[PDB]
Nucleic acid binder design. Structure first.
Ligand SMILES: COC(=O)[C@@]12OC[C@]34[C@H]([C@@H](O)[C@@H]1O)[C@@]1(C)CC(=O)C(O)=C(C)[C@@H]1C[C@H]3OC(=O)[C@H](OC(=O)/C=C(\C)C(C)C)[C@@H]24
Ligand SMILES: [Cl-]
Ligand SMILES: [Cl-]
Ligand SMILES: [K+]
Ligand SMILES: [Mg+2]
Ligand SMILES: [Mg+2]
Ligand SMILES: [Mg+2]
Ligand SMILES: [Mg+2]
Ligand SMILES: [Mg+2]
Ligand SMILES: [Mg+2]
Ligand SMILES: [Mg+2]
Ligand SMILES: [Mg+2]
Ligand SMILES: [Mg+2]
Ligand SMILES: [Mg+2]
Ligand SMILES: [Mg+2]
Ligand SMILES: [Mg+2]
Ligand SMILES: [Mg+2]
Ligand SMILES: [Mg+2]
Ligand SMILES: [Mg+2]
Ligand SMILES: [Mg+2]
Ligand SMILES: [Mg+2]
Ligand SMILES: [Mg+2]
Ligand SMILES: [Mg+2]
Ligand SMILES: [Mg+2]
Ligand SMILES: [Mg+2]
Ligand SMILES: [Mg+2]
Ligand code: NA
Ligand code: NA
Ligand code: NA
Ligand code: NA
Ligand code: NA
Ligand code: NA
Ligand code: NA
Ligand code: NA
Ligand code: NA
Ligand code: NA
Ligand code: NA
Ligand code: NA
Ligand code: NA
Ligand code: NA
Ligand code: NA
Ligand code: NA
Ligand code: NA
Ligand code: NA
Ligand SMILES: [Sr+2]
Ligand SMILES: [Sr+2]
Ligand SMILES: [Sr+2]
Ligand SMILES: [Sr+2]
Ligand SMILES: [Sr+2]
Ligand SMILES: [Sr+2]
Ligand SMILES: [Sr+2]
Ligand SMILES: [Sr+2]
Ligand SMILES: [Sr+2]
Ligand SMILES: [Sr+2]
Ligand SMILES: [Sr+2]
Ligand SMILES: [Sr+2]
Ligand SMILES: [Sr+2]
Ligand SMILES: [Sr+2]
Ligand SMILES: [Sr+2]
Ligand SMILES: [Sr+2]
Ligand SMILES: [Sr+2]
Ligand SMILES: [Sr+2]
Ligand SMILES: [Sr+2]
Ligand SMILES: [Sr+2]
Ligand SMILES: [Sr+2]
Ligand SMILES: [Sr+2]
Ligand SMILES: [Sr+2]
Ligand SMILES: [Sr+2]
Ligand SMILES: [Sr+2]
Ligand SMILES: [Sr+2]
Ligand SMILES: [Sr+2]
Ligand SMILES: [Sr+2]
Ligand SMILES: [Sr+2]
Ligand SMILES: [Sr+2]
Ligand SMILES: [Sr+2]
Ligand SMILES: [Sr+2]
Ligand SMILES: [Sr+2]
Lengths: 337, 132, 53
RNA sequence: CGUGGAAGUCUGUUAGAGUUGGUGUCCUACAAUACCCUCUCGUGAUCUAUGUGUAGGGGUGAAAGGCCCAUCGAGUCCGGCA
RNA sequence: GCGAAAGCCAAGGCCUGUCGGGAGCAACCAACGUUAGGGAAUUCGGCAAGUUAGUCCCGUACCUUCGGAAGAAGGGAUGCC
RNA sequence: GGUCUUAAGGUAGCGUAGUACCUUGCCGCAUCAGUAGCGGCUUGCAUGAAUGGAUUAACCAGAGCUUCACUGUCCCAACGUUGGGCCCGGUGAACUGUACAUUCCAGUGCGGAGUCUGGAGACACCCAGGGGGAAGCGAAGACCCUAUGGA
RNA sequence: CGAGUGGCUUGCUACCUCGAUGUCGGUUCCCUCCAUCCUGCCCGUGCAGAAGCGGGCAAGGGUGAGGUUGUUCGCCUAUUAAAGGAGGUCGUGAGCUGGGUUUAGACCGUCGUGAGACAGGUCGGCUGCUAUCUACUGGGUGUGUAGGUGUCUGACAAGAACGACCGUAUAGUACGAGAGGAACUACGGUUGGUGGCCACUGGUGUACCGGUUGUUCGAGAGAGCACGUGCCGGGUAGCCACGCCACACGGGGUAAGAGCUGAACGCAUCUAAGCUCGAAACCCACUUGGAAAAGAGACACCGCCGAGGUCCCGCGUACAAGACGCGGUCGAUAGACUCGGGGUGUGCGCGUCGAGGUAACGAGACGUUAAGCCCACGAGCACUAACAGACCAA
C-alpha cells in the first residue's frame, strides 16, 4: 500500500531565497523582567576549537567530571549604541516616532551613513516623553553599529548597523537607561549584556552554496538501482499528479541554497574573555589570529568565518542558567593536520 | 533505556553476521531486529553497541542452530564516542546471548567488553573477563 | 596521554582507542599512525616517529 | 615410460566471423540499423575476394514465411487505369 | 612476453576522427575514480559493478558413454643482487 | 458394472510436469519468515511409448534455485576526474502554429474548460531549471465492430 | 425486517474519445479525505489493580524492515506506540522500471480432418521528441508609489518544527488473599523529522610527498607515456555524514466530557439566558518571507550643484548571466619574499659497510639528513599591482 514517509525538508524556512541583509535581523525579543538593559550584542565568526569542561548539570551522573565540548570562537569587540529610536502604538502596529543621536561618532562610520551634523537631541527626547505621558509609547530600541576595524582578520572597515531593543524595568526607567548609554559615546561590551554560562540565541546569514539540486537542497533521494543508470540520477520522480494541473510550491525543486537568515536557539556561552587564549596554531583557517575580546559559543553557529553574527538572551530556554563554567583546557592545536 | 554515556554510530544492520562472545554453543549470530527501534522508509534497521537485539544462530551446535534468541551487542567495529571526545573501536562485532531477565545464557564470556555495556547490563558485566 | 605508536602527546579531545582481540588497548593520536600500524610497520623503523629518534 | 600428434578438441579482441547483456550512448543520429563495454566462434558443416548460375506464384531457404538492391504471407517498373 | 597479445618506442605519417574564447568552471547529464561500518537488506532477477586472474609446485570429489569430470575444489611459491 | 459407444480400454515407465483446473495440493529439506527451488507422495481437470517413453556422462551468451567469495545494488549518500552544461566571437537549422491567451479554485457544458458562469488572484519584461497541464508534439488506432473491402 | 450514506469492489448503460487521452504492478515526489491503527482528552464496563473489551471528541504528527509471488490482494517472520483505510485520469511512462497482460519465434496439454484455436501453462521478444504557452522553484531588468544613505514597520504568507518511545526516582509503593502491580511529578537517554555547522571521528582530496612494475630519453641524475593518477602507500585545505550543535514551557478560546448557578415546570435539571473547566486538535507564543499592502508605509540624517550612485581597479564572507559583499595609498585587497602553521617520510652527491668476485663489478645498509620536496591556511611585510580617470544625479 506504499509506505508512509515524512516530506522532504521543512516548509517553515520559505522561500529559500537569498537574504536581503547580510546583517541578521531579529524578529522577536526577550520579556521585560529585571534591570533595564540592551537585549543583544554582535560579533564576527572566527572559527572552531574544543574546550574541556567540568559538568555543571546537577541532574547528570557525570556531575564534576571532565567533558570535551566543541566550541565556536567569535571575536566580540565593543559596539557603539549611536542612537535611541522610540516607537509609538498606532492602530496599524508600531511605527517609529523619533531618534535621539549623539556628537561622538567613530572615524569610519561615514562609510555606511550620512553622519549627522545638525540634530536636536532635546526636542526628540521631549517628543518621546510627551508620548509616554499620553500612553502612546511602544518600545525603546537603540541604533547600534559594530567596529570591524578592531578586528584585524575581517577586511571590512564599513560598520554593520542594526537595531537592538532595551527591555527591563518600567518604560520610564529604561528610557533613562537607554539615554545614558547613548549620551556618553554609546560604548558597551559583551560583559554589559551577557554573563558566561547563559543561553543565547545566535542569528546569522548562512554559508552561500549557490544553486543546488533537490537532493542537497531538500534531502530527496537519489535515483536507486536500475533507475540510477537510465539518464536520471538526482532528479525527483514527478512534479505532481495529473490533477491539480499545476506544480505546487511544496514540491522539492532546484534553486538557491544557503545565504539565508537562521536564528539558532539556546546556545550556551562557555566563556567571555579577552586576549589570545582560543587562538589556533598557524591561525584559524581562512580567518587569521585572535588577540582581543572574544566569546566561546557551545557548538555550531550559522555563517562562515568573517561573518557578522548576532546575540540575544534566549527567548525560550529549556534549562536554568549554570553560570561561569570551569574551563580546564582550551585547545590551541592547529586546525591544519 | 538508561543512558550509555557514549554516542554510538550503529555499525550493524538487520541481517548482519556477528560473533557470539560466550560458551553457549552458538558461534555465529545473525541480527533480526533491534529492541525498541522503529525506522523510516527504505532505511535498514540499525543496531549498535549496547543495544538489545533479536538474533538467529547461523553457525554452532545442532541444538543451538536455527533458534531465535535475544542478545546484547557487546563489541562493534565502527567507532563510538566517549565524553572526553576519544573514539573507541573493536577488532570484531560481537554479541552475548541473553534471556528474558537479561541474564547471560552461558557462564563464561569470550573476549573484551565496553564499559558502557557493562553499566547498562549488570549481570553481563559480572561475567565479563575484560572491560575496556 | 601519549600515543602507543609514535610517542607524541595526544591532544585531549582527539584520537582513537583500538581494542585488540585479546583485550590489549592501543591509543592512537591520528589516522596516519593507525594506517602505518595496519601496514605491519613498527614505529621504531620509521624516522619521523618520536619512538625512533 | 617415451615417441607420435589425432581432433566438426580446448584457451585465445592473431587475422577473421558472429552479436548475449547493458533493455547503457544515440534516437530532428555520425548512422533510414550507428557508438562503447560485455559476450560467442576462431583447422572447419570454417571465413573470404572475384568470376559464374537459379527470377516473381517463380528462385533460394540447416525453415525464421527468412532472403531475392532501405521493397516480400508473393520483388521492381510501366501499362490496364481516370 | 607463449604470442601477429598489452604497454612503450623507431622508420614513416600526422596535429584535418578540423570552430574557438571565458568562468575552481553552480544545478543537471554522459563517461569514470575513491568511499567508513554493514554486505544483496537492492531488484522480477546480483541487472550494473565487482571478485578471481599469468607461471611453477602440491593436491583434486560425485558421476562417467572410461574420452571426460579437471585449471574440479583446496594449499604453497613468485622481485632484485 | 462384477459389458456400452466406436476397434481397443493406457502396458514399461514418468508424474502437481515448460503437461495438474482445483493449487501457495500434503509431507520433508532450507530460511527468522520461501505462491520460489529440490526430494517424496501423486486418484494424471487433460502423462505415456519413433504424435516416441525413460534415462543420461559431455556440451550451452538457453529457463529456475542454493552456498562460499566480492562489492555503493541497497542502508545513504559524499568528494573527485574528463566532456558538456553557463557567459563571449563566429556559423546556424528543425519540430510546431484557427484565433485570443497572467492564471487559480469551484461550477456549467457532448458527462475530462487558459477562453462559458461565479468568485479569487494578477505591474511589464528577461535568465536558469526540472517537466504538473495544454485530455502537449509525433502516426487518418494494429485492439473492437462495420463494409454484399483485400490478401 | 425496515431506513439510508458513500462512490473503495463488482455489475449495468453506451453519453464522451477510435485523423490514438500510452497498460497492470512497482517506484519516486506532492496535496487531500475520515468511516481513527497509534499518539492527546474523554464515557461505560461483566471498571480492585495491571492488562483489556466497547464507545466519544479528534486528521497535528506517525503508521516502519523483511521471506514466497510480476502481482494488486494475500500468507509468513522479527521488531513497533501503531506498523489504519481511502481520493487525487484505479495521482504519477514529454519521470523511471518493463516482471505480468497483449504482436511477429517456439514448446506442452486440450480441441480441430485441417489451416489453426484456447479468458490454459511456458522460454524469448523495442520504451520516440531541442518546452511555444501555462505552472511552479530560484535569479535578474524596468516601470509605479515621487533626490539620497541607513534603520524599521507588518497587511498578509509558510511551518510539524516538532512527533513518539524507553529508562530512573515515585515504588515493589496505592490496589489485591495472593499472584500480580500502577499514577501525578522530576529527571536521564533513544528514535523519526527539522535547521545549521566541520574543533572532534569518518570519506574524498587525478593539490601534494613517497614506493614501485614496463618502456623511451645511452647509464646516473631527472623525466614522458601506461585514459584522462600505470599501480600501490600517506594525505593538507575545502566540501561533506557515518561526525557535532540547536529545535519548550506557557497563555487564550473550544470539541467530547466533568461541573456551577438556573428557569420554563414552586421540585428537579450542566443549558434555554449566564458561568467554571477541558484534547497531540484551533489561536497566540517561536522560526522564515514580506513596501507592489494602489490606503503602494514609518523614522533619522545627508543633499538639490551637488548627497549619493555608476563605470573603472584589487578581490571574495557572493556567484550559471545578472545579482551580492569588501578593499582601493588617509591602504594589508591580491601577488612576490620571510617566517608561522601543515603534508610526506629522510634528497642529489660524497664517505664507511656490503653477500661475493682475481679484478671489473655489486642488490642493499649507515651517516651526512626531524632530511629533501610540497601547501588552495595564517602573520610580517607597501617591493609589485589596487594607477589614471570617465559618467550620471534632484
Ligand atoms: C497514444 O495512445 C493513446 O492515446 C491511447 O490512449 C490511451 C489508450 C487508449 C486510447 O484512448 C488511445 O488510442 C484506451 C484509453 C482506449 C480504450 O478504450 C481502452 O479500453 C484501452 C484498453 C486504452 C488504454 C490505452 O491503450 C492503448 O493501446 C492506447 O495506446 C495506443 O493505442 C497506442 C500507442 C501508445 C501507439 C502505439 C500509437 C491508448
Ligand atoms: Cl528511483
Ligand atoms: Cl526489523
Ligand atoms: K480512443
Ligand atoms: Mg581540519
Ligand atoms: Mg589530527
Ligand atoms: Mg521500498
Ligand atoms: Mg558468388
Ligand atoms: Mg508462424
Ligand atoms: Mg562501504
Ligand atoms: Mg553481470
Ligand atoms: Mg514441487
Ligand atoms: Mg506405438
Ligand atoms: Mg481509424
Ligand atoms: Mg484482428
Ligand atoms: Mg478474400
Ligand atoms: Mg498525454
Ligand atoms: Mg468522528
Ligand atoms: Mg494533514
Ligand atoms: Mg523488497
Ligand atoms: Mg494510474
Ligand atoms: Mg505525467
Ligand atoms: Mg515514454
Ligand atoms: Mg523526453
Ligand atoms: Mg516471467
Ligand atoms: Mg513472458
Ligand atoms: Na536518457
Ligand atoms: Na499519465
Ligand atoms: Na601412446
Ligand atoms: Na555488440
Ligand atoms: Na509475384
Ligand atoms: Na494421448
Ligand atoms: Na553454441
Ligand atoms: Na560510485
Ligand atoms: Na510540463
Ligand atoms: Na447511495
Ligand atoms: Na462504476
Ligand atoms: Na504504474
Ligand atoms: Na491525525
Ligand atoms: Na511481500
Ligand atoms: Na489515464
Ligand atoms: Na507504468
Ligand atoms: Na517509457
Ligand atoms: Na487551553
Ligand atoms: Sr531587527
Ligand atoms: Sr516578523
Ligand atoms: Sr532506459
Ligand atoms: Sr484540470
Ligand atoms: Sr533485452
Ligand atoms: Sr553520442
Ligand atoms: Sr535505434
Ligand atoms: Sr556499462
Ligand atoms: Sr575459442
Ligand atoms: Sr576448432
Ligand atoms: Sr494506373
Ligand atoms: Sr616518428
Ligand atoms: Sr575547418
Ligand atoms: Sr586515496
Ligand atoms: Sr537476493
Ligand atoms: Sr591458488
Ligand atoms: Sr496405470
Ligand atoms: Sr471570468
Ligand atoms: Sr530544459
Ligand atoms: Sr487511542
Ligand atoms: Sr529479496
Ligand atoms: Sr487492483
Ligand atoms: Sr491470492
Ligand atoms: Sr496513491
Ligand atoms: Sr514485459
Ligand atoms: Sr498469469
Ligand atoms: Sr493466455
Ligand atoms: Sr502606470
Ligand atoms: Sr516505572
Ligand atoms: Sr513480585
Ligand atoms: Sr597521464
Ligand atoms: Sr458542555
Ligand atoms: Sr513603496
Amino acid at each position: 500500500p506504499q509506505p508512509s514517509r515524512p516530506r522532504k525538508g521543512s516548509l517553515g524556512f520559505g522561500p529559500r531565497k537569498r537574504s536581503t541583509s547580510e546583517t541578521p535581523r531579529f524578529n522577536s525579543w526577550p520579556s521585560d523582567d529585571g534591570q533595564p538593559g540592551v537585549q543583544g550584542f554582535a560579533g564576527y565568526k572566527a572559527g572552531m576549537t574544543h574546550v574541556v569542561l567540568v559538568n555543571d548539570e546537577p541532574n547528570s551522573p557525570r556531575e564534576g567530571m571532565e567533558e570535551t565540548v566543541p566550541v565556536t570562537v567569535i571575536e566580540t569587540p565593543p559596539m557603539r549604541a549611536v542612537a535611541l529610536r522610540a516607537y509609538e502604538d498606532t492602530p496599524y502596529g508600531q511605527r517609529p516616532l523619533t531618534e535621539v543621536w549623539t556628537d561622538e561618532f567613530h572615524s569610519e562610520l561615514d562609510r555606511t551613513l550620512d553622519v549627522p551634523e545638525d540634530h536636536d537631541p532635546d526636542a526628540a527626547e521631549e517628543q518621546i516623553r510627551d508620548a509616554h505621558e499620553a500612553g502612546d509609547l511602544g518600545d525603546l530600541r537603540l541604533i547600534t553599529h559594530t567596529v570591524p576595524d578592531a578586528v584585524p582578520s575581517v577586511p571590512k572597515k564599513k560598520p554593520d548597523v542594526m537595531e537592538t531593543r532595551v527591555g527591563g524595568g518600567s518604560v520610564s526607567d529604561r528610557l533613562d537607561h537607554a539615554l545614558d548609554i547613548v549620551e556618553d559615546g554609546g560604548e558597551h561590551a559583551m560583559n554589559d549584556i551577557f554573563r558566561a554560562g547563559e543561553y543565547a540565541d545566535v542569528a546569522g546569514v548562512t554559508k552561500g552554496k549557490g544553486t543546488q539540486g533537490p537532493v542537497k537542497r531538500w534531502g530527496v533521494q537519489k535515483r536507486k538501482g536500475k533507475h540510477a543508470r537510465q539518464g536520471w540520477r538526482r532528479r525527483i520522480g514527478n512534479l505532481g499528479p495529473w490533477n491539480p494541473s499545476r506544480v505546487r510550491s511544496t514540491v522539492p525543486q532546484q534553486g538557491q541554497t544557503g545565504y539565508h537568515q537562521r536564528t539558532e536557539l539556546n546556545k550556551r556561552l562557555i566563556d567571555i574573555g579577552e586576549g589570545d587564549e582560543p587562538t589556533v596554531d598557524g591561525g584559524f583557517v581562512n580567518y587569521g589570529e585572535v588577540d582581543g575580546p572574544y566569546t566561546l559559543v557551545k557548538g555550531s553557529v550559522p555563517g562562515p568565518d568573517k561573518r557578522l553574527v548576532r546575540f540575544r538572551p534566549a527567548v525560550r530556554p529549556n534549562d536554568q542558567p549554570r553560570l561561569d563554567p570551569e574551563v580546564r583546557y582550551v585547545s590551541n592545536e592547529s586546525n591544519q593536520g | 533505556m538508561e543512558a550509555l554515556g557514549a554516542d554510538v554510530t550503529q555499525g550493524l544492520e538487520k541481517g548482519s553476521l556477528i560473533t557470539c562472545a560466550d560458551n553457549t554453543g552458538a558461534r555465529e549470530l545473525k541480527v533480526i531486529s533491534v529492541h525498541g527501534y522503529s525506522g523510516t522508509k527504505n532505511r535498514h534497521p540499525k543496531a549498535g553497541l549496547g543495544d538489545k537485539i533479536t538474533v538467529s544462530v547461523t553457525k554452532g551446535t545442532p541444538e543451538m542452530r536455527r533458534q531465535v534468541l535475544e542478545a546484547v551487542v557487546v563489541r562493534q567495529r565502527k567507532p563510538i564516542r566517549r565524553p572526553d571526545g576519544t573514539r573507541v573501536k573493536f577488532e570484531d562485532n560481537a554479541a552475548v546471548i541473553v534471556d528474558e531477565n537479561e541474564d547471560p545464557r552461558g557462564t563464561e564470556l569470550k573476549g573484551p567488553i565496553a564499559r558502557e555495556v557493562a553499566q547498562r547490563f549488570g549481570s553481563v558485566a559480572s561475567a565479563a573477563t575484560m572491560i575496556v | 596521554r601519549e600515543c602507543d605508536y609514535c610517542g607524541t602527546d595526544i591532544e585531549p579531545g582527539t584520537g582513537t582507542m583500538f581494542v585488540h582481540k585479546d583485550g590489549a588497548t592501543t591509543h592512537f593520536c591520528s589516522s596516519k599512525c593507525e594506517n602505518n600500524a595496519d601496514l605491519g610497520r613498527e614505529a621504531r623503523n620509521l624516522e619521523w616517529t618520536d619512538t625512533a629518534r
